């Protein structure tokens with residue numbers, strides 16, 4: 461069909477979704493996220509084998525992440541259940557087709573977890589990636605955090621999150637995050653060919669395995685108590701002062717000062 465924030469394209473049985481939010485740098489706004497969900501929903505058809513997420517060629521930034529302004533004021537949980545990021549990720553995961561991420565430019569925060577949540581990840585030799593909840597003082601959620609612990613080692617993810625610094629593709633590759641890393645000029649082709657090949661295969665097989673794999677990576681559980689406990693700390697980081705100072709600094713585009721409360 462036709463979407464406002466997105467741009468779908470079919471090549472054989474390969475669908476390619478292109479982000480069209482250049483004005484907000486492809487920040488994760490509900491509006492955007494919603495369209496992305498409509499476009500996927502739409503593409504859930506027998507004729508479609510493999511999907512592909514991408515940012516317009518030339519892009520300097522894949523996605524800047526969550527839209528701060530859209531962040532909570534400090535009344536509820538930002539990272540709620542029905543929060544845009546939660547939905548698309550759950551969605552992407554339970555999606556019966558393979559979803560490749562062709563990355564161009566930089567990825568930030570929520571983007572990283574989003575593309576992390578996909579099945580494959582091909583990237584330009586130049587992209588960079590960085591997890592940044594700490595730069596603003598955000599107490600992510602458990603699930604969000606989990607989805608980042610399925611490829612790279614703990615120490616690595618810890619380093620990622622902790623310093624909130626950006627890593628290069630080459631590194632992100634070496635640590636087992638991305639599948640491949642190509643030269644810009646070759647990025648599209650490469651990704652395409654792969655999607656075509658994968659689409660030569662038994663769609664029904666793929667759907668089940670991807671579901672088994674999903675069912676497995678979630679096989680991490682804990683008691684009632686333990687959840688509320690972390691949830692409590694979560695709440696407490698919200699109502700924090702360092703918190704507020706976190707947004708501000710940014711909005712005021714000034715370097716923040718964390719106190720410890």
Ligand SMILES: C[C@H](CSCCNC(=O)CCNC(=O)[C@H](O)C(C)(C)COP(=O)(O)OP(=O)(O)OC[C@H]1O[C@@H](n2cnc3c(N)ncnc32)[C@H](O)[C@@H]1OP(=O)(O)O)C(=O)O
Nearest residue numbers: 487521524525526527528529568569570571592593596598
């Ligand atoms: C954990 C995480 C935290 S929430 C957010 C995580 N996002 C980040 O950590 C990325 C922060 N954004 C940036 O580092 C940068 O904007 C970056 C690298 C994308 C571009 O640097 P740049 O020099 O090319 O551009 P810039 O700094 O001039 O920013 C240009 C414009 O984009 C806006 N802008 C950038 N990122 C965001 C965002 N996430 N939400 C809302 N507005 C944003 C700036 O406020 C600004 O608007 P005006 O100039 O009109 O005022 C998450 O839930 O995702």
